[PDB]
Design a binder for this molecule. Structure first.
Ligand SMILES: Nc1ncnc2c1ncn2[C@@H]1O[C@H](COP(=O)(O)OP(=O)(O)OC[C@H]2O[C@H](O)[C@H](O)[C@@H]2O)[C@@H](O)[C@H]1O
Ligand SMILES: Nc1ncnc2c1ncn2[C@@H]1O[C@H](COP(=O)(O)OP(=O)(O)OC[C@H]2O[C@H](O)[C@H](O)[C@@H]2O)[C@@H](O)[C@H]1O
Ligand SMILES: [Mn+2]
Ligand SMILES: [Mn+2]
Lengths: 156, 156
C-alpha cells in the first residue's frame, strides 16, 4: 500500500512502509549543438534559489509521448524545431522519486518562433560550460551535465 | 515563506507560493574503473519498483563533507577504498528538489572489507552498460548514466 500525504500539481508525496516516495511526471530534455555551441537554458528555480545551467527540458503532458513533449518544449523554450533522435533515459534520483527523463538529440535546428520569456537561452560551447562549472561560476542541472558529457563523449 | 507540509527522514515537502519543493540531503556518487569495467551497483528502489544501474552513491550525513561521504559509501557498498578526486556536481531535478549530487572519481582501488548485502556489486564495461540500456534490458539512474558518459568522454 502506498498511502498518500499530498497530491499536488507536479508531485504526489506517498509513504510505502518506511519509504518516502515522490511521484512525479516524466520529463524530457534535448541536447542540441550548433556551430560548436550547445543550447543551454537558465531560469530561476525556487527549489534551489538560483538558475543552474540546464538544457531545454519539460514535463510530458497528458496525451503526449516523449518525442512530442521534446518537440514542444524545444519550441516553447527556445523557438526552435529540429530533427529529434532518442538517446537514452534515466531516473533522476530513484532513492526517492520515480521521475524519469527521456533525452533526445536535436539536429538541423530552424527557428519556428521569435517563446517563454522567463527562460534565458544560453548558447555556449560545452568546453566553456564545463570550465565555468569547474571554477564555481555556474551550477549544473542533471540535464545540463548530461548534455556536456554526451557532447564530449560523442559529438566532437 | 516556505510552509512545510511534511518533515521526514530523507525529505521535507514544502510550499513556496505556487511551488511544491522537496528538500533533500545532498548526495555523493563515485565513478571507478578497473580493467575496463566500471563499478556499478544495483538495489531494489521502491520509488521506481525496479533496480536501475547506478554507481556507488549515498547521502552526506551530519558532520561529513562530500569527500568523506564518498569514501564511506564506497566502502559500505562495495568494500573498496581508493584515491578520490572531485569531478563536478549537479542538481538532480531543480524544478522541484534541492538535492545536489557531488561526483568523484576513484582510482587505485583496494579491498578494505569482504559490505551492505542488499546492494549488488555489478562490475561491467561501460560500453556494455550503454548497449544493454539501448536494448531495453536495464534502466539507468542519473549517477549511472553520468558514470557511463564520463567514461566515454574522458577515460578511454
Ligand atoms: N525513499 C526513502 N525513504 C526513507 N528512507 C530511505 C529512502 N531511501 C533510502 N532510505 C534510507 O536512507 C538511508 C541513507 O541512504 P544512502 O544509502 O546513504 O543513500 P541512497 O543510495 O539511498 O541515495 C544516494 C543517491 O542515489 C539515488 O539517486 C538516491 O535518490 C540519492 O540521490 C538508507 O539507509 C535508507 O535506510
Ligand atoms: N516545483 C513546482 N511546483 C509547482 N509547479 C511547478 C514547479 N516547477 C514548475 N512548475 C509548473 O509546472 C509546469 C510544467 O513544467 P515544464 O516547464 O514542462 O518543466 P520544467 O522545466 O519545470 O521541468 C523539466 C525538468 O527539468 C528540471 O530538472 C525539472 O526538475 C524537471 O525534471 C510549469 O509551467 C510550471 O508552471
Ligand atoms: Mn522547462
Ligand atoms: Mn546507496
Amino acid at each position: 500500500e502506498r498511502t498518500y500525504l499530498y497530491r499536488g500539481r507536479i508531485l504526489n508525496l506517498a509513504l510505502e512502509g518506511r519509504y518516502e516516495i515522490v511521484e512525479h511526471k516524466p520529463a524530457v530534455a534535448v541536447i542540441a549543438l550548433r556551430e560548436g555551441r550547445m543550447l543551454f537554458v537558465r531560469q530561476m528555480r525556487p527549489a534551489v534559489g538560483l538558475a543552474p545551467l540546464e538544457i531545454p527540458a519539460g514535463l510530458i503532458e497528458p496525451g503526449e509521448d516523449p518525442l512530442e513533449a521534446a518537440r514542444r518544449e524545444l519550441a516553447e523554450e527556445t523557438g526552435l524545431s529540429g530533427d529529434l533522435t532518442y538517446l537514452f533515459s534515466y531516473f533522476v534520483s530513484p532513492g526517492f522519486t520515480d521521475e524519469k527523463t527521456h533525452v533526445f538529440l536535436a539536429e538541423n535546428l530552424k527557428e519556428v518562433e521569435a517563446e517563454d520569456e522567463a527562460i534565458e537561452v544560453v548558447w555556449m560551447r560545452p568546453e566553456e560550460a564545463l570550465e565555468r562549472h569547474q571554477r564555481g561560476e555556474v551550477e549544473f542541472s542533471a540535464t545540463g551535465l548530461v548534455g556536456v558529457l554526451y557532447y564530449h563523449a560523442f559529438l566532437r
